[PDB]
Design an enzyme around this catalytic site. Structure first.
Site, short mmCIF file in Angstrom:
data_model
loop_
_atom_site.label_atom_id
_atom_site.label_comp_id
_atom_site.label_asym_id
_atom_site.label_seq_id
_atom_site.Cartn_x
_atom_site.Cartn_y
_atom_site.Cartn_z
N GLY D 56 0.81 -1.20 0.00
CA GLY D 56 0.00 0.00 0.00
C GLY D 56 0.85 1.25 0.00
O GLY D 56 0.67 2.14 -0.83
N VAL D 58 3.79 1.65 -1.01
CA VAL D 58 4.51 1.82 -2.27
C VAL D 58 3.67 2.60 -3.27
O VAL D 58 4.18 3.47 -3.99
CB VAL D 58 4.93 0.45 -2.84
N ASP D 59 2.37 2.33 -3.32
CA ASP D 59 1.56 2.79 -4.44
C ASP D 59 1.10 4.23 -4.29
O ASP D 59 0.66 4.84 -5.28
CB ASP D 59 0.36 1.87 -4.63
N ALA D 60 1.18 4.81 -3.09
CA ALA D 60 0.53 6.09 -2.84
C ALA D 60 0.83 7.12 -3.92
O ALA D 60 -0.08 7.77 -4.44
CB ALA D 60 0.95 6.62 -1.47
N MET D 63 -0.06 6.12 -7.81
CA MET D 63 -1.48 6.18 -8.11
C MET D 63 -2.01 7.61 -8.12
O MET D 63 -3.06 7.85 -8.72
CB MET D 63 -2.25 5.34 -7.09
#
Lengths: 77, 57, 77, 77
Positions: D56, D58-60, D63
């Site tokens: 989670g 990682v994606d902040a 995205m």
């Protein structure tokens, strides 16, 4: 043909990037396969089976990259 | 060999190369070690210490 | 008009970069799968299971980029 | 005119970079997760829980970037 000369740069960017990506991905995966084999030679055929099993995924994008780049190079251009 | 208080028997038994133990590899897949530094260096000292232990026994 | 001359380059990049990303990502992720397998075979079904589970999450953004790149290269252009 | 197309070039660069980032980051993370599992498959669910917790984080940023690609391609347009 200013329009056309940008296409033969576009195919170049697409397939050069695809080249680096696929080449290095397969290099890494095959390297791990090679050390695995050197550990357990009498597993070599099963590890080759698995190497081919996964390697098909590393090509998933980079071939599509050729699929469109070369198409443009020879059907659009 | 101190079999029993009334009976002892001379035995000549091999300790190198290492006798095939009554063991099965099937049980091994459950887990494996973090070798520090690496297994090839550890196995040597393990076998040497093992032979010493058997001469002592 | 000038639109034909830029879009076939913009999509080219937009997809070559996703190629690099997915290729290297999957190469690295599969390397550890192969080393683990060669270490402890017969756990291969379980490694393959959770490998595919994870791998599905690696393709997300690369495939989104591929889709939007194509959506441009044809449907926009 | 350029006030159209260069928006697409910006979208391409932004999403390409975001894709490489998310893909390679999760590839590294998942690789270490895989070998951790291989050394002791009986922890797998706990490792997977922490794996998601981190993936989670990682994606902040990627995205965000991916969505801004759409904000460009469909609101600035």
């Amino acid at each position: 043909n200013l329009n056309m000369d940008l296409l033969y740069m576009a195919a170049a960017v697409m397939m050069g990037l695809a080249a680096i990506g696929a080449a290095i991905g397969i290099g890494i995966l095959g390297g791990k396969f090679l050390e695995g084999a050197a550990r357990q030679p009498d597993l070599i055929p099963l590890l080759r089976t698995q190497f081919f099993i996964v390697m098909g995924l590393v090509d998933a994008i980079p071939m599509i990259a050729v699929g469109l780049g070369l198409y443009v190079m020879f059907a659009v251009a | 060999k101190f079999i029993n208080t009334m009976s002892q028997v001379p035995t000549i038994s091999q300790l190198l190369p290492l006798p095939a133990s009554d063991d099965d590899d099937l049980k091994h897949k459950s887990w494996d070690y973090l070798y520090e530094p690496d297994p090839k260096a550890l196995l040597d000292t393990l076998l040497r210490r093992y032979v010493e232990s058997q001469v002592y026994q």
